[PDB]
């Protein structure tokens, strides 16, 4: 339980590499078959899904800035305090609400742009 914690601090800033790397098959390899990616109010379920929308991800780069680990029942829940760059410099602040389950694995992923 304490090793999740952990783990999910490891993972988080994995995803921010594969992020910036586009590893879009790296970055669905942690998320859970059948997992929601609620794109700012959009769902989208399944790996198939999920996936459409990495490659569609705009050119941004990413820098954490803040990281929360709380604690819900057997699932832990992360919130990132994301930093994305576009090409033209613009900088949005972004949030992340990331959820893993005992296989460490990612069963909801809510990216938050409006501030
Ligand atoms: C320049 O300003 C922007 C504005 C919007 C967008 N934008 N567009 C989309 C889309 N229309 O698909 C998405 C994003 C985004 O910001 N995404 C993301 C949010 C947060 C993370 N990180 C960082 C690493 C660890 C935690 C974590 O969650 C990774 C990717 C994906 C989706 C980009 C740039």
Redesign the pocket.
């Known amino acids: 339980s304490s090793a999740r914690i952990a783990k999910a601090k490891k993972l988080?800033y994995k995803?921010?590499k594969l992020?910036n790397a586009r590893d879009n098959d790296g970055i669905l390899k942690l998320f859970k078959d059948d997992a929601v990616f609620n794109?700012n109010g959009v769902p989208y379920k399944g790996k198939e899904a999920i996936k459409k929308?990495l490659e569609?991800?705009?050119k941004?780069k990413?820098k954490?800035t803040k990281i929360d680990i709380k604690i819900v029942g057997n699932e832990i829940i992360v919130n990132?305090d994301?930093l994305?760059?576009?090409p033209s410099g613009?900088?949005?602040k972004?949030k992340?609400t990331?959820t893993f389950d005992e296989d460490m694995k990612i069963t909801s992923y809510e990216?938050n742009?409006e501030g």
């Open positions: 988080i995803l921010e992020w794109l929308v569609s991800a705009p941004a990413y954490i990132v994301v994305a760059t576009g613009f900088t949005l972004v992340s990331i990216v742009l």
